[PDB]
Amino acid sequence: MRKRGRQTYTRYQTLELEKEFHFNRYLTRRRRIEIAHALSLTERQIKIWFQNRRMKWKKENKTKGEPG
């Protein structure tokens, strides 16, 4: 048995991805490849995580939460 959590990501991975999102809310192919070369991942998975990062951002930029 094992199952530490429901995440496909890792600490270090998420750290860099978070720094990188703090650096830029978008990344192009070449950059994403660089991240994948530095981090050992796939442009897809990274794009999805990145997508989710700003997904929550645009759903948490003082816009959600209708008290009236």
UniProtKB/Swiss-Prot annotation:
It is found in: Nucleus. Residues 2-61 bind DNA. Belongs to the Antp homeobox family. Loss of Antp results in altered development of the embryonic thoracic segments. Overexpression can cause antennae to be transformed into legs. Sequence-specific transcription factor which is part of a developmental regulatory system that regulates segmental identity in the mesothorax. Provides cells with specific positional identities on the anterior-posterior axis. This is Homeotic protein antennapedia. The chain holds residues 297 to 363 of 378 of the full protein.
